[PDB]
Amino acid sequence: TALVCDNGSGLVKAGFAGDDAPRAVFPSIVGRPRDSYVGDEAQSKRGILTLKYPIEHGIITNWDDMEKIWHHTFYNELRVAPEEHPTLLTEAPLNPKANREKMTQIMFETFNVPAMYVAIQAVLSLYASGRTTGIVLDSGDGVTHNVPIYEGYALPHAIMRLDLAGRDLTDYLMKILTERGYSFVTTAEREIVRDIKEKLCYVALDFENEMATAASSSSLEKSYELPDGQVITIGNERFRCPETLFQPSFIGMESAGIHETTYNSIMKCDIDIRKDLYANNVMSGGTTMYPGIADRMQKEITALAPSTMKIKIIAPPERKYSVWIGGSILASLSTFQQMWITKQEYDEAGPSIV
């Protein structure tokens, strides 16, 4: 049975083609002493380990550590002999061929997989939504991408990248949370802020009005009970965290907001298919999970684009695993048999085959 691995900057999603969800989801972290630990086990012993993220902004930068992530994925997580399973791996859009070459070489030469295939994350997400044309807003832990896609293929010139995502958001919430008096500095407390971000944060339909409402009543305030018993209150930080997506300025980035990069990306594609991009904005990624993000994006984009144009945002309820699901469907198709790359063909052609 084919395996499907979606190597994100923060979480690795892994499972079996045919399943509607990844069986394994763990941190993309490798820890080494003074001979290595991965994911939760790496975090358990963070005290005696130097922790590193092998994937930076969706791009693999540490091959020695990436190898440990894959070893842990196959053996510990899935409990399977790599040599008996065809493997589908995902990659960030505009990923350097050298990287795709290294990826392939490691799979075949160190894990001896019988066959493999590398798919672009944004395109798998679009397939999962039952579309061949549209534009994907892909937002995770380490990067956000705007990928317009026409008839199955990502339009190279129009792709946009924004190095701001979930981790940055967590960092910001932690920052404005202290200002409000509270304090989460240590590594152990940062997990608390992430839980607050995922449980209480949301996108305001209108930032200005929410700021007003919050300075007057306490109608927007939600309580968050700490483990030790304490109960801290969160008010405007709920929608100020996600606001950073539309206004990267909050964290000091002259960068354009996600509504802005979506519009610019659509604007760099043939005008004839623009009506289609506008009506097929698909969002995928943990960081697009905030409640109210569809409505905001819906309003922000019609403000930018000409009023006669019809805007439609598709925000799938499981968009956090959309990439993995699209690959699960892809690697299950009777046609996928031919598009693999076999170990045999690799032994002859080498890296230049992927």
């Binding site: 499972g15 399943d19 579309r131 469907i329 046609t335």
Partner: protein, 131 residues
């Protein structure tokens, strides 16, 4: 490229060819049932036109039923791209949703379009992350 039998039979002669996605596979619909779609399934439609100038014309439509499962609508979408790739990309792709089919699509069926409850079952095995 695909050795998949149906890809070899695609767009070889003027006409209409319909497939239904069934457990991650493209299965041809009996000719006599053309126009009858299971609202819980997904299909791929290929229309080939005779263009005098020895210029065969192709239009690929993937129809999504209101109760078709994610794995089906996804497969219909993917099959469409592979079939088009197979046909050298000469086909124009079209997403058709139940109830809102394009005027072009509806025209392929002289005696109207007819829906019907039911369908083949999802090829998706259910699981819950980290369990």
């Amino acid at each position: 490229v695909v050795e998949h039998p149906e890809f070899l039979k695609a767009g070889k002669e003027p006409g209409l060819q319909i497939w239904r996605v069934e457990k991650f596979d493209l299965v041809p619909v009996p000719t006599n049932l053309y126009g009858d779609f299971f609202t819980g399934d997904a299909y791929v439609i290929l229309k080939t036109v005779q263009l005098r100038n020895g210029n065969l014309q192709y239009d690929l439509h993937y129809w999504l039923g209101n109760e078709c499962s994610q794995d089906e609508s996804g497969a219909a979408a993917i099959f469409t791209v592979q079939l088009d790739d197979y046909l050298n990309g000469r086909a124009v792709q079209h997403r058709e949703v139940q109830g809102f089919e394009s005027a072009t699509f509806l025209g392929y069926f002289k005696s109207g379009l007819k829906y019907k409850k039911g369908g083949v079952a999802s090829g998706f095995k259910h699981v819950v992350p980290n369990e």
